[PDB]
Ligand binder design. Structure first.
Ligand SMILES: Nc1nc2c(ncn2[C@@H]2O[C@H](COP(=O)(O)OP(=O)(O)OP(=O)(O)O)[C@@H](O)[C@H]2O)c(=O)[nH]1
Ligand SMILES: Nc1nc2c(ncn2[C@@H]2O[C@H](COP(=O)(O)OP(=O)(O)OP(=O)(O)O)[C@@H](O)[C@H]2O)c(=O)[nH]1
Ligand SMILES: COc1ccc(/N=N\c2cc(OC)c(OC)c(OC)c2)cc1O
Ligand SMILES: [Ca+2]
Ligand SMILES: [Mg+2]
Ligand SMILES: [Mg+2]
Lengths: 155, 436, 426
């Protein structure tokens, strides 16, 4: 079962191991018990080269886990700017919504990743998208008094 | 001659104590080392001043006093000041850690580490007496030591000296010079636990003394030194009958007979006049009638309240100086024709008068001018219930939310004690309403 | 109540702790070798509170320096007052904690905890009347947060009757964009609610904001932020270090500032605000109560003050301070709870801090502090919902339930602040 080994290699950042496993028929879209794929794990742990390799070998850029998280939600939450750009160039849905009503914009705003917020707004992120509590990313900036984030969202 | 022992507890009791004993030495002619040249009997005697001072074989006149505090800073200033040789060194007792403005630390935890030492040192003073009448206890309501340690001491004194009288001088808190937010709690707790152990208590409201210093003495921002000098003048006027020859309030029992009709309503109001600034050294001398009328002005009271809203149960006028008795009779006769003086229907409408013909003494460095005649009026009026209402209201505002209560419970005190103390204060307020 | 034993743990704790010792040694006329060169008896009156007296009248800080990273010891030693610390008081481990609270609190940190306790023991035994402890640390890292909180609990066990005070630095992504910091901070806050008597909340979000928007510093450094920290630390300890009218101590501060045991997180403030190398009493009292001058990113006008302590330093009329302080309470009466009478205390100290003629330090117990806790709680929840990096904690022995319990406790703390903010006297 090369799928379980590919999940481990993607998380661990073993680039060579990823190439060999794919060459031997490993499922690039294998999931762990919570529905996470190799692309979700490489995007969470910041392995840019693994993300690029997987996208050139059939990884679904918009795969969701059991909680509706896409690779773009996780890269925006963790703050990996270069991976957010690579995902958007490969067709990631900028406005994907998870089970909490969050979009990647809500997660980059909460975590204070202001350069990722700018990138998402430039790629069409919806400033009116509300989470399950009715909050937009603008509401989060006003409620927490983050004036730097509020200025960017108002541009 | 029957001896009186003074006990000074906590910072306020100690600092007021030091100001009082300095003034007593000046009134009696006792020098800072204890020598008294006007005392013809060396090594003993039964003169009226011997009620407050014992005598050694070398002619040293030593205060019958004990100073107690849970930390040493304040008492250390007494041990090194102008009057360091006056006191019995074993008479100045200090711990190492104070009550942190917490009644429970003063009463239950820290206070218990020194209580037996204090009682043993008091017994050494009592053993020197031929006819001990009782104790004068000085303390703040607001401090942890002044509130908590005093209650513990008063409880023990009642067991060990059952038939002896106990009189208090208590400092009632004011915002302008307060130390702590929890002072209303400490004040109510100490009032409840000392009520059955105290025969008579003179409350001194720091706000009343602070206002007098500002209005009469032109003191911009009064400090404790200015408050304490005025307080000592008033305390001396109250205790003069015990230390000098006289016919009014000559012993502790007589204070209760004249001023306390029922055991619980034992809080007389003191009024003092005239208070004149030392910078007015050529002030016109005020007559007996003018100073006597000034006793019925709320601005001259030791506690802020309005005796026009209440009824009198007793009234004692104590004069010092160039005072002719017929002038007092005439001033009182005029004062009786006044709509704002009402007595309860069960007390005689009389005014008790005592005159000491020596004018008051001023301390060098004081803020008061010399005067040829002064008066202290001591009355039992139901208007003092206004002081208790003000204090109970501050207690209720915090207690409703149980604010700060955890500090007391964490120091060996049960939360039910707060409700029991408050209920006793509600009954006290009703005792005054039932009289009038 | 005299001696305080100071402990500084982790990178942040040691950096701000060294700055504290540099700033207060200058105020007490103490040079880097430990000799006194001051010109006032007031500087030595209460010197025993922070320093031990040694041979040749050499004043040595009562300070214990701790870190799992050994490189911190050399950075401390190379500072101006780096040689003043007792050589036997440096307790350093072999490898850092890697911003992991579980390493600091359960594995590497737990192996070095008994060594620090022996040093606390020797320092405490040589105190005539120990009042308590003061700890400097960050909440976002692994050592100051995980090991600092473990140390607090063990000291709390051996010395239950002593006061435990902390200067706790809150994380912000504006200064450190490390996504595990809300986890470390939340786990630490659960410990601080239970085991400390008083905590000064020094928020990196606020420190960054002051440097950037007020002081005009486009790229704030740790040296810039720490300048505001050392000024605040000097101000809030003034009444412990100088005689003044009040014989202040850590326990009297706690009894008068903390009405409910869990609500012991203070919002410090300072005026005037200054930058490195770069006022009347009415101005000082106004700046002191302004959101722009607070060291926690909270707007005091969004909450109510339960209690406040204010210290004015320099030569000024105490009657003027009394008047102006009464004034602020009248015009801003809606921002004070009405069920705690006389809840504002003022102190005046003659000696002002370095480079300033007049200064004011504010210590507020304000329900507006819930904004700081809500900020961290929201970040903790965003990470926790996705279980991001949870294996880094559970792999060191931690149970996932500890995260849940910490989250539930902080949300309860926010509800308790809201409760007293809405309460009325009636
Ligand atoms: N008039 C007057 N009031 C004083 C003096 N010292 C303190 N007070 C008042 O007493 C209260 C504080 O109690 P303290 O006597 O200082 O405290 P303590 O009895 O030493 O108790 P702890 O210090 O808590 O152990 C406040 O209301 C002060 O305003 C003084 O010398 N004169
Ligand atoms: N104000 C301020 N914050 C600092 C300073 N040094 C570190 N921090 C903050 O502290 C947090 C990181 O904690 P550190 O103190 O570096 O970590 P530690 O306690 O040494 O723990 P490990 O290194 O993981 O073992 C982040 O929020 C930093 O922004 C400093 O000098 N000043
Ligand atoms: C709200 O009322 C109170 C506040 C605290 C009180 N006493 N403790 C101290 C006072 C201090 O400054 C005023 C201080 O500097 C901060 C200090 O340093 C440790 C202790 C007393 C109060 O009545
Ligand atoms: Ca004689
Ligand atoms: Mg005291
Ligand atoms: Mg570190």
């Amino acid at each position: 079962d090369l799928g379980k080994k590919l999940l481990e290699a993607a998380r661990a950042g073993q680039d060579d191991e990823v190439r060999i496993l794919m060459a031997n028929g490993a499922d690039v879209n294998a999931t762990d018990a919570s529905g996470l794929t190799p692309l979700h794990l490489a995007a969470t742990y910041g392995h840019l080269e693994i993300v690029e390799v997987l996208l050139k070998h059939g990884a679904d850029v918009n795969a969701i886990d059991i909680m509706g998280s896409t690779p773009l939600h996780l890269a925006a939450l963790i703050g990996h700017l270069e991976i957010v750009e690579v995902l958007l160039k490969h067709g990631a849905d900028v406005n994907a919504v998870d089970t909490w009503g969050d979009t990647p914009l809500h997660l980059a705003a909460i975590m204070g990743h202001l350069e990722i917020v700018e990138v998402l707004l430039k790629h069409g992120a919806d400033v009116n998208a509300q989470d399950k509590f009715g909050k937009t990313a603008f509401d989060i900036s006003i409620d927490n008094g983050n004036e730097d984030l509020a200025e960017i969202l108002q541009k | 001659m029957r001896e009186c022992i003074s006990i000074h507890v906590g910072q306020a009791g100690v600092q007021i104590g030091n100001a009082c004993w300095e003034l007593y030495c000046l009134e009696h002619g006792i020098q800072p080392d204890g020598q008294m040249p006007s005392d013809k009997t060396i090594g003993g005697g039964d003169d009226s001043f011997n009620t407050f001072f014992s005598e050694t074989g070398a002619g040293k006149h030593v205060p019958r006093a004990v100073f107690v505090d849970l930390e040493p800073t304040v008492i250390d200033e007494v041990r090194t000041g102008t009057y360091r040789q006056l006191f019995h060194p074993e008479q100045l007792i200090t711990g190492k850690e104070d009550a942190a403005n917490n009644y429970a630390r003063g009463h239950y935890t820290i206070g218990k580490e020194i209580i037996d030492l204090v009682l043993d040192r008091i017994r050494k003073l009592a053993d020197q007496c031929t006819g001990l009448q009782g104790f004068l206890v000085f303390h703040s309501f607001g401090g942890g030591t002044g509130s908590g340690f005093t209650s513990l001491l008063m409880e023990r004194l009642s067991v060990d000296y059952g038939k002896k009288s106990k009189l208090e001088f208590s400092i009632y808190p004011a915002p302008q010079v307060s130390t702590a937010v929890v002072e209303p709690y400490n004040s109510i707790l100490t009032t409840h636990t000392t009520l059955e152990h105290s025969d008579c208590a003179f409350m001194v409201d720091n706000e009343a003394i602070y206002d007098i210093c500002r209005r009469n003495l032109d003191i911009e921002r009064p400090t404790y030194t200015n408050l304490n000098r005025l307080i000592s003048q008033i305390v001396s006027s109250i205790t003069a009958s015990l230390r000098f020859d006289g016919a009014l309030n000559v012993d502790l029992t007589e204070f209760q007979t004249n001023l306390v009709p029922y055991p619980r309503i034992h809080f007389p109001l003191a009024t003092y006049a005239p208070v004149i600034s030392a910078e007015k050294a050529y002030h016109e001398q005020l007559s007996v009638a003018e100073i006597t009328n000034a006793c019925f002005e709320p601005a001259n009271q030791m506690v802020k309240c309005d005796p026009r809203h209440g009824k009198y149960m007793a009234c004692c006028l104590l004069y010092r100086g160039d005072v002719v008795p017929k002038d007092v009779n005439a001033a009182i006769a005029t004062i009786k024709t006044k709509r704002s003086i009402q007595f309860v229907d069960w007390c005689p409408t009389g005014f008790k008068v005592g005159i000491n013909y020596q004018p008051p003494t001023v301390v060098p460095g004081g803020d008061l001018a010399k005067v040829q005649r002064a008066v202290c009026m001591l009355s039992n009026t139901t208007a003092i219930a206004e002081a208790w209402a003000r204090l109970d209201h501050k207690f209720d505002l915090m207690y409703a939310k149980r604010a700060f209560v955890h500090w007391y419970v964490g120091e060996g005190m049960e939360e039910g004690e707060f409700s029991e103390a408050r209920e006793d204060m509600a009954a006290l307020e009703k005792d005054y309403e039932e009289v009038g | 109540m005299r001696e305080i034993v100071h402990i500084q743990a982790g990178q942040c704790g040691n950096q701000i702790g060294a700055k504290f010792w540099e700033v207060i040694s200058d105020e007490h006329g103490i040079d880097p070798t430990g000799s006194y060169h001051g010109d006032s008896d007031l500087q030595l009156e209460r010197i025993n509170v922070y320093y031990n007296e040694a041979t040749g009248n050499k004043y040595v800080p009562r300070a214990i320096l701790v870190d799992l990273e050994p490189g911190t010891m050399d950075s401390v030693r190379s500072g101006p007052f780096g040689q003043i610390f007792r050589p036997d008081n440096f307790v350093f481990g072999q490898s850092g904690a890697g911003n992991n609270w579980a390493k600091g609190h359960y594995t590497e940190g737990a192996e070095l905890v008994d060594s620090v306790l022996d040093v606390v023991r020797k320092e405490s035994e040589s105190c005539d009347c120990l009042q308590g402890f003061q700890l400097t640390h960050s909440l976002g890292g692994g050592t100051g947060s995980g090991m600092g909180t473990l140390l607090i609990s063990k000291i709390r066990e051996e010395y239950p009757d002593r006061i435990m005070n902390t200067f706790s630095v809150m994380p912000s992504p504006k200064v450190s964009d490390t996504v595990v910091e809300p986890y470390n901070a939340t786990l630490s806050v659960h410990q601080l609610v239970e085991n400390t008597d008083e905590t000064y909340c020094i928020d990196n979000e606020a420190l960054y904001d002051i440097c950037f928007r007020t002081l005009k510093l486009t790229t704030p450094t740790y040296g810039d932020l720490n300048h505001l920290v050392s000024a605040t630390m000097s101000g809030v300890t003034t009444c412990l270090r100088f005689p003044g009218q009040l014989n202040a101590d850590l326990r009297k501060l706690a009894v008068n500032m903390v009405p409910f045991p869990r609500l012991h997180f203070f919002m410090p403030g300072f005026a005037p605000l200054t930058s490195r190398g770069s006022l009347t009493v009415p101005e000082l009292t106004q700046q002191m109560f302004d959101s722009k001058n607070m060291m926690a990113a909270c707007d005091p006008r969004h909450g109510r003050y339960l209690t406040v302590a204010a210290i004015f330093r320099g030569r000024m009329s105490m009657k003027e301070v009394d008047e102006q302080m009464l004034n602020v309470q009248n015009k801003n009466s809606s921002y004070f709870v009405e069920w705690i009478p006389n809840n504002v205390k003022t102190a005046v100290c003659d000696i002002p801090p370095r480079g300033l003629k007049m200064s004011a330090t504010f210590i507020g117990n304000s329900t507006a502090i819930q904004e700081l806790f809500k900020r961290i709680s929201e970040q903790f929840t965003a990470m926790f919902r996705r279980k991001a990096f949870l294996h880094w904690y559970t792999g060191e022995g931690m149970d996932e339930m500890e995260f849940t319990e910490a989250e539930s406790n902080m949300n309860d703390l926010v509800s308790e602040y809201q409760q007293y903010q809405d309460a009325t006297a009636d």
